[PDB]
Amino acid sequence: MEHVAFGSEDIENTLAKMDDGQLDGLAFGAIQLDGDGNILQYNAAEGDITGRDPKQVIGKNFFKDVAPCTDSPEFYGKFKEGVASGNLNTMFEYTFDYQMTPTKVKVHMKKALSGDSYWVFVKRV
Ligand SMILES: *C(=O)/C=C\c1ccc(O)cc1
C-alpha cells in the first residue's frame, strides 16, 4: 500500500509524486481530471467501486460519458465553479448508480498542485 489517508490536508503534495503504478496502491479511489472533465488518471480502487476498467476510461469525459450520474448541480456544478474560480476543496456524500448497484460514497474534490488538473477522491461509506 501507499500510506495516505483520505481527506489529508496536504494530499495534493503527496500525490504529485506518484505515477499510475503508485496511485493504484491508494486505499481509496482517485481520479485526475483536466478543467474540461476529461480523465487523465483513474486508479484501481475507483475501478473496484464502479466496475470501470481504469485503462479504458482514460481520455473519456467524466461528466458527459463515463459518470453521467454526477452531471448535476451537486457534483458537476461544484466542479465547474472550482475550475472557474481556480480553487476547489469540498467533501460530500453521493450515490453512484449509473449502470451499477447504487453505491453510497464519500467524495473529496480538490485542485491539484499542478495548473489545470483536479482530483476526485472516493471511498465507500
Ligand atoms: C454515476 O455516474 C455513476 C457511475 C460512475 C462511474 C464511474 C465513476 O468513476 C464514477 C461514477
Short mmCIF file of N, CA and C and ligand atoms in Angstrom, two decimals:
data_model
loop_
_atom_site.label_atom_id
_atom_site.label_comp_id
_atom_site.label_asym_id
_atom_site.label_seq_id
_atom_site.Cartn_x
_atom_site.Cartn_y
_atom_site.Cartn_z
N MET A 1 0.82 -1.20 0.00
CA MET A 1 0.00 0.00 0.00
C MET A 1 0.86 1.27 0.00
N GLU A 2 0.23 2.36 -0.40
CA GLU A 2 0.73 3.72 -0.32
C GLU A 2 0.09 4.41 0.87
N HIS A 3 0.82 4.72 1.94
CA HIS A 3 0.10 5.23 3.11
C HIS A 3 -0.19 6.73 3.05
N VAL A 4 -1.41 7.04 2.66
CA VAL A 4 -2.06 8.33 2.55
C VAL A 4 -3.50 8.23 3.04
N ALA A 5 -3.91 9.11 3.95
CA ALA A 5 -5.26 8.98 4.48
C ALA A 5 -6.24 9.82 3.68
N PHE A 6 -7.45 9.29 3.52
CA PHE A 6 -8.47 10.05 2.79
C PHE A 6 -8.75 11.36 3.51
N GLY A 7 -8.73 12.44 2.75
CA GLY A 7 -9.00 13.76 3.23
C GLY A 7 -7.85 14.44 3.93
N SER A 8 -6.62 13.94 3.83
CA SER A 8 -5.49 14.66 4.40
C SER A 8 -5.37 16.06 3.79
N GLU A 9 -4.90 16.99 4.60
CA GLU A 9 -4.69 18.40 4.35
C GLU A 9 -3.70 18.69 3.24
N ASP A 10 -2.69 17.84 3.11
CA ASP A 10 -1.67 18.07 2.09
C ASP A 10 -1.69 16.97 1.03
N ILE A 11 -2.86 16.42 0.77
CA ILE A 11 -2.96 15.28 -0.15
C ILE A 11 -2.47 15.62 -1.55
N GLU A 12 -2.62 16.86 -2.01
CA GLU A 12 -2.15 17.19 -3.36
C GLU A 12 -0.63 17.25 -3.45
N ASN A 13 0.07 17.53 -2.36
CA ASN A 13 1.53 17.49 -2.38
C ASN A 13 2.02 16.04 -2.39
N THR A 14 1.34 15.18 -1.64
CA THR A 14 1.71 13.77 -1.63
C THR A 14 1.46 13.09 -2.97
N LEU A 15 0.33 13.36 -3.62
CA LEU A 15 0.06 12.64 -4.86
C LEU A 15 0.76 13.24 -6.07
N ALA A 16 1.53 14.31 -5.88
CA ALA A 16 2.17 14.91 -7.05
C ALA A 16 3.32 14.00 -7.48
N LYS A 17 3.75 13.18 -6.53
CA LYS A 17 4.91 12.32 -6.76
C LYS A 17 4.60 10.97 -7.39
N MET A 18 3.35 10.54 -7.42
CA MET A 18 3.00 9.20 -7.85
C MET A 18 2.60 9.05 -9.31
N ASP A 19 3.20 8.08 -9.99
CA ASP A 19 2.83 7.63 -11.33
C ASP A 19 1.59 6.74 -11.23
N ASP A 20 1.07 6.24 -12.35
CA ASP A 20 -0.16 5.44 -12.25
C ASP A 20 0.08 4.21 -11.37
N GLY A 21 1.27 3.63 -11.45
CA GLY A 21 1.57 2.45 -10.63
C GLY A 21 1.29 2.73 -9.16
N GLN A 22 1.83 3.83 -8.67
CA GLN A 22 1.66 4.22 -7.28
C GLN A 22 0.23 4.60 -6.94
N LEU A 23 -0.49 5.26 -7.85
CA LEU A 23 -1.86 5.63 -7.49
C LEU A 23 -2.71 4.38 -7.25
N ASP A 24 -2.30 3.26 -7.83
CA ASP A 24 -3.03 2.00 -7.66
C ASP A 24 -2.84 1.43 -6.26
N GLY A 25 -1.89 1.96 -5.48
CA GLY A 25 -1.64 1.49 -4.14
C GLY A 25 -2.47 2.22 -3.10
N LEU A 26 -3.17 3.28 -3.48
CA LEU A 26 -4.02 4.00 -2.53
C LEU A 26 -5.15 3.12 -2.01
N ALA A 27 -5.63 3.45 -0.82
CA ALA A 27 -6.73 2.69 -0.21
C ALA A 27 -8.08 3.26 -0.59
N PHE A 28 -8.10 4.23 -1.49
CA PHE A 28 -9.33 4.90 -1.90
C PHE A 28 -9.27 5.20 -3.39
N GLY A 29 -10.42 5.51 -3.99
CA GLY A 29 -10.36 5.82 -5.41
C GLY A 29 -9.86 7.24 -5.65
N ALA A 30 -9.12 7.38 -6.74
CA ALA A 30 -8.55 8.61 -7.25
C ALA A 30 -8.70 8.71 -8.76
N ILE A 31 -9.29 9.83 -9.15
CA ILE A 31 -9.47 10.29 -10.50
C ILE A 31 -8.83 11.67 -10.67
N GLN A 32 -8.03 11.82 -11.72
CA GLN A 32 -7.48 13.12 -12.05
C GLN A 32 -8.14 13.59 -13.35
N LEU A 33 -8.62 14.83 -13.24
CA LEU A 33 -9.37 15.42 -14.33
C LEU A 33 -8.72 16.71 -14.82
N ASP A 34 -8.84 17.00 -16.11
CA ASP A 34 -8.46 18.36 -16.54
C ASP A 34 -9.64 19.29 -16.30
N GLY A 35 -9.59 20.55 -16.72
CA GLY A 35 -10.60 21.55 -16.43
C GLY A 35 -11.86 21.39 -17.24
N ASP A 36 -11.81 20.54 -18.24
CA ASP A 36 -12.91 20.16 -19.11
C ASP A 36 -13.65 18.93 -18.59
N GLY A 37 -13.09 18.17 -17.66
CA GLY A 37 -13.74 16.95 -17.18
C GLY A 37 -13.17 15.69 -17.79
N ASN A 38 -12.20 15.85 -18.68
CA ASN A 38 -11.55 14.68 -19.27
C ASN A 38 -10.71 13.94 -18.26
N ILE A 39 -10.73 12.61 -18.32
CA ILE A 39 -9.98 11.80 -17.37
C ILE A 39 -8.51 11.62 -17.76
N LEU A 40 -7.62 12.00 -16.87
CA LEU A 40 -6.17 11.93 -17.02
C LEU A 40 -5.61 10.71 -16.31
N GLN A 41 -6.18 10.33 -15.18
CA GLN A 41 -5.76 9.18 -14.40
C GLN A 41 -6.99 8.58 -13.69
N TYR A 42 -6.97 7.27 -13.49
CA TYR A 42 -8.12 6.57 -12.90
C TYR A 42 -7.54 5.35 -12.18
N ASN A 43 -7.59 5.32 -10.85
CA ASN A 43 -6.86 4.21 -10.21
C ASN A 43 -7.72 2.98 -10.02
N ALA A 44 -7.03 1.94 -9.56
CA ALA A 44 -7.59 0.61 -9.41
C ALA A 44 -8.74 0.58 -8.42
N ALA A 45 -8.57 1.32 -7.33
CA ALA A 45 -9.55 1.39 -6.26
C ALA A 45 -10.87 1.96 -6.75
N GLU A 46 -10.78 3.00 -7.60
CA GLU A 46 -12.00 3.52 -8.21
C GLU A 46 -12.64 2.44 -9.10
N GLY A 47 -11.88 1.71 -9.92
CA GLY A 47 -12.44 0.62 -10.72
C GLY A 47 -13.16 -0.42 -9.87
N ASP A 48 -12.68 -0.67 -8.65
CA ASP A 48 -13.29 -1.68 -7.79
C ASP A 48 -14.67 -1.22 -7.30
N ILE A 49 -14.78 0.09 -7.06
CA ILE A 49 -16.09 0.61 -6.65
C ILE A 49 -17.07 0.72 -7.81
N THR A 50 -16.68 1.27 -8.95
CA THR A 50 -17.60 1.49 -10.06
C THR A 50 -17.66 0.38 -11.11
N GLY A 51 -16.74 -0.57 -11.14
CA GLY A 51 -16.73 -1.61 -12.16
C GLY A 51 -16.01 -1.22 -13.43
N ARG A 52 -15.57 0.03 -13.52
CA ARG A 52 -14.90 0.51 -14.73
C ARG A 52 -13.46 0.02 -14.79
N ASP A 53 -13.02 -0.30 -16.00
CA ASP A 53 -11.63 -0.67 -16.26
C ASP A 53 -10.87 0.63 -16.47
N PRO A 54 -9.97 0.93 -15.53
CA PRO A 54 -9.25 2.20 -15.47
C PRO A 54 -8.70 2.61 -16.83
N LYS A 55 -8.01 1.70 -17.50
CA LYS A 55 -7.31 1.93 -18.75
C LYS A 55 -8.25 2.25 -19.91
N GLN A 56 -9.52 1.89 -19.77
CA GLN A 56 -10.49 2.10 -20.84
C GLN A 56 -11.24 3.42 -20.68
N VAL A 57 -11.14 4.04 -19.51
CA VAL A 57 -11.87 5.30 -19.30
C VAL A 57 -10.97 6.50 -19.49
N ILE A 58 -9.66 6.26 -19.51
CA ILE A 58 -8.74 7.40 -19.67
C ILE A 58 -9.01 8.07 -21.01
N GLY A 59 -9.17 9.39 -20.99
CA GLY A 59 -9.45 10.15 -22.19
C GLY A 59 -10.92 10.39 -22.42
N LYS A 60 -11.79 9.66 -21.73
CA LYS A 60 -13.21 9.99 -21.89
C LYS A 60 -13.60 11.16 -20.99
N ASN A 61 -14.77 11.72 -21.30
CA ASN A 61 -15.22 12.83 -20.45
C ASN A 61 -15.99 12.22 -19.28
N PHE A 62 -15.61 12.58 -18.05
CA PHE A 62 -16.17 12.03 -16.84
C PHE A 62 -17.64 12.39 -16.71
N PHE A 63 -18.01 13.64 -16.96
CA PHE A 63 -19.38 14.08 -16.76
C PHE A 63 -20.30 13.80 -17.93
N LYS A 64 -19.75 13.79 -19.14
CA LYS A 64 -20.61 13.53 -20.29
C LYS A 64 -20.76 12.04 -20.58
N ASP A 65 -19.70 11.24 -20.45
CA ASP A 65 -19.67 9.89 -20.97
C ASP A 65 -19.62 8.76 -19.94
N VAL A 66 -18.68 8.84 -19.00
CA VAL A 66 -18.39 7.79 -18.04
C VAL A 66 -19.33 7.81 -16.85
N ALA A 67 -19.51 8.98 -16.25
CA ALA A 67 -20.27 9.08 -14.99
C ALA A 67 -21.33 10.15 -15.10
N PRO A 68 -22.32 9.94 -15.96
CA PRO A 68 -23.35 10.97 -16.15
C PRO A 68 -24.20 11.22 -14.92
N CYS A 69 -24.10 10.32 -13.95
CA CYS A 69 -24.88 10.47 -12.71
C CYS A 69 -24.36 11.61 -11.86
N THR A 70 -23.16 12.08 -12.16
CA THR A 70 -22.55 13.22 -11.49
C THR A 70 -22.78 14.53 -12.24
N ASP A 71 -23.48 14.51 -13.36
CA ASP A 71 -23.86 15.70 -14.12
C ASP A 71 -25.15 16.29 -13.53
N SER A 72 -24.87 17.11 -12.51
CA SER A 72 -25.90 17.69 -11.68
C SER A 72 -25.31 18.91 -10.99
N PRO A 73 -26.08 19.85 -10.49
CA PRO A 73 -25.51 20.95 -9.70
C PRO A 73 -24.77 20.52 -8.44
N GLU A 74 -25.09 19.36 -7.86
CA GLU A 74 -24.43 18.91 -6.63
C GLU A 74 -23.03 18.37 -6.84
N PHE A 75 -22.65 18.03 -8.07
CA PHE A 75 -21.31 17.48 -8.29
C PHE A 75 -20.61 18.29 -9.37
N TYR A 76 -21.06 18.12 -10.61
CA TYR A 76 -20.55 18.89 -11.73
C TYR A 76 -20.63 20.39 -11.48
N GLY A 77 -21.75 20.90 -10.96
CA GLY A 77 -21.85 22.31 -10.65
C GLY A 77 -20.75 22.83 -9.74
N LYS A 78 -20.39 22.08 -8.71
CA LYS A 78 -19.31 22.46 -7.80
C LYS A 78 -17.97 22.37 -8.53
N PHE A 79 -17.86 21.34 -9.37
CA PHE A 79 -16.57 21.20 -10.07
C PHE A 79 -16.33 22.41 -10.95
N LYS A 80 -17.36 22.78 -11.72
CA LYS A 80 -17.24 23.83 -12.72
C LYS A 80 -17.01 25.17 -12.03
N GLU A 81 -17.64 25.38 -10.87
CA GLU A 81 -17.33 26.60 -10.13
C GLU A 81 -15.87 26.63 -9.69
N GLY A 82 -15.35 25.51 -9.20
CA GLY A 82 -13.97 25.41 -8.77
C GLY A 82 -12.97 25.68 -9.88
N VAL A 83 -13.16 25.06 -11.03
CA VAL A 83 -12.35 25.32 -12.22
C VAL A 83 -12.35 26.80 -12.54
N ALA A 84 -13.53 27.41 -12.59
CA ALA A 84 -13.71 28.81 -12.90
C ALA A 84 -13.03 29.74 -11.90
N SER A 85 -13.18 29.41 -10.62
CA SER A 85 -12.57 30.16 -9.54
C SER A 85 -11.08 29.88 -9.40
N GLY A 86 -10.63 28.72 -9.86
CA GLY A 86 -9.23 28.34 -9.73
C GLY A 86 -8.91 27.83 -8.33
N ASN A 87 -9.96 27.49 -7.59
CA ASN A 87 -9.82 26.92 -6.25
C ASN A 87 -10.98 25.96 -6.01
N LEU A 88 -10.66 24.86 -5.34
CA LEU A 88 -11.63 23.81 -5.10
C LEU A 88 -11.18 22.92 -3.94
N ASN A 89 -12.02 22.78 -2.94
CA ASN A 89 -11.79 21.92 -1.78
C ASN A 89 -13.11 21.68 -1.07
N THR A 90 -13.72 20.55 -1.44
CA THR A 90 -15.04 20.20 -0.94
C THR A 90 -15.23 18.69 -0.83
N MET A 91 -15.98 18.32 0.19
CA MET A 91 -16.22 16.94 0.54
C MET A 91 -17.72 16.74 0.74
N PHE A 92 -18.27 15.67 0.19
CA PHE A 92 -19.71 15.45 0.29
C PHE A 92 -19.99 13.98 0.01
N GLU A 93 -21.11 13.50 0.53
CA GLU A 93 -21.64 12.18 0.22
C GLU A 93 -22.44 12.22 -1.08
N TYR A 94 -22.40 11.13 -1.81
CA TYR A 94 -23.08 10.98 -3.11
C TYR A 94 -23.41 9.50 -3.33
N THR A 95 -24.36 9.23 -4.22
CA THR A 95 -24.74 7.88 -4.60
C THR A 95 -24.42 7.63 -6.08
N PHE A 96 -23.64 6.60 -6.35
CA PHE A 96 -23.23 6.24 -7.70
C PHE A 96 -24.15 5.12 -8.21
N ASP A 97 -24.91 5.43 -9.24
CA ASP A 97 -25.96 4.49 -9.65
C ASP A 97 -26.06 4.28 -11.15
N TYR A 98 -25.12 4.84 -11.91
CA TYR A 98 -25.23 4.62 -13.36
C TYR A 98 -24.67 3.26 -13.76
N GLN A 99 -25.52 2.38 -14.27
CA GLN A 99 -25.07 1.09 -14.79
C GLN A 99 -24.45 0.20 -13.72
N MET A 100 -24.85 0.41 -12.47
CA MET A 100 -24.28 -0.32 -11.35
C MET A 100 -25.25 -0.41 -10.19
N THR A 101 -24.92 -1.29 -9.24
CA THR A 101 -25.64 -1.28 -7.97
C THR A 101 -25.40 0.06 -7.29
N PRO A 102 -26.48 0.72 -6.88
CA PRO A 102 -26.37 2.04 -6.24
C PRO A 102 -25.45 1.93 -5.04
N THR A 103 -24.45 2.80 -5.01
CA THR A 103 -23.40 2.71 -4.02
C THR A 103 -23.15 4.07 -3.38
N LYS A 104 -23.28 4.10 -2.06
CA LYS A 104 -23.01 5.31 -1.31
C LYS A 104 -21.51 5.54 -1.11
N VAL A 105 -21.08 6.73 -1.46
CA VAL A 105 -19.67 7.04 -1.35
C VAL A 105 -19.48 8.41 -0.73
N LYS A 106 -18.26 8.58 -0.23
CA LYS A 106 -17.81 9.94 0.11
C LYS A 106 -16.91 10.44 -1.02
N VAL A 107 -17.10 11.67 -1.43
CA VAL A 107 -16.32 12.31 -2.48
C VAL A 107 -15.57 13.51 -1.92
N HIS A 108 -14.30 13.62 -2.27
CA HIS A 108 -13.47 14.77 -1.94
C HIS A 108 -12.93 15.31 -3.27
N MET A 109 -13.30 16.53 -3.61
CA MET A 109 -12.75 17.20 -4.79
C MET A 109 -11.79 18.30 -4.30
N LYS A 110 -10.64 18.35 -4.94
CA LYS A 110 -9.60 19.32 -4.62
C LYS A 110 -8.71 19.61 -5.83
N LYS A 111 -8.33 20.87 -6.00
CA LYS A 111 -7.45 21.29 -7.08
C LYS A 111 -6.09 20.60 -6.95
N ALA A 112 -5.50 20.13 -8.04
CA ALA A 112 -4.15 19.59 -7.99
C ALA A 112 -3.11 20.69 -7.75
N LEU A 113 -1.90 20.29 -7.37
CA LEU A 113 -0.80 21.24 -7.21
C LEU A 113 -0.37 21.77 -8.58
N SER A 114 -0.78 21.04 -9.60
CA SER A 114 -0.49 21.39 -10.98
C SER A 114 -1.59 22.27 -11.56
N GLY A 115 -1.19 23.24 -12.36
CA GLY A 115 -2.02 24.21 -13.02
C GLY A 115 -3.47 23.87 -13.26
N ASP A 116 -3.78 23.08 -14.29
CA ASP A 116 -5.20 22.88 -14.61
C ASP A 116 -5.64 21.44 -14.43
N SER A 117 -5.31 20.86 -13.28
CA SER A 117 -5.73 19.47 -13.03
C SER A 117 -6.40 19.43 -11.66
N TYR A 118 -7.35 18.51 -11.52
CA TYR A 118 -8.21 18.43 -10.36
C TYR A 118 -8.43 16.97 -9.99
N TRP A 119 -8.36 16.72 -8.69
CA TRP A 119 -8.52 15.42 -8.10
C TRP A 119 -9.96 15.18 -7.65
N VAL A 120 -10.41 13.96 -7.91
CA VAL A 120 -11.61 13.44 -7.31
C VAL A 120 -11.23 12.19 -6.51
N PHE A 121 -11.44 12.23 -5.20
CA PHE A 121 -11.19 11.06 -4.35
C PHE A 121 -12.50 10.46 -3.84
N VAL A 122 -12.52 9.14 -3.75
CA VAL A 122 -13.74 8.42 -3.42
C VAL A 122 -13.48 7.27 -2.45
N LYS A 123 -14.38 7.12 -1.47
CA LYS A 123 -14.32 5.97 -0.57
C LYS A 123 -15.72 5.53 -0.17
N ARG A 124 -15.87 4.26 0.18
CA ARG A 124 -17.20 3.70 0.46
C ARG A 124 -17.62 4.24 1.83
N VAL A 125 -18.90 4.46 2.05
CA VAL A 125 -19.41 4.85 3.36
C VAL A 125 -20.53 3.90 3.81
C1 LIG B 1 -22.90 7.74 -11.86
O1 LIG B 1 -22.29 8.33 -12.78
C2 LIG B 1 -22.14 6.64 -11.50
C3 LIG B 1 -21.11 5.94 -12.07
C4 LIG B 1 -19.79 6.28 -12.05
C5 LIG B 1 -18.90 5.60 -12.88
C6 LIG B 1 -17.54 5.84 -12.81
C7 LIG B 1 -17.10 6.78 -11.89
O2 LIG B 1 -15.75 6.96 -11.74
C8 LIG B 1 -17.98 7.48 -11.09
C9 LIG B 1 -19.36 7.26 -11.16
#
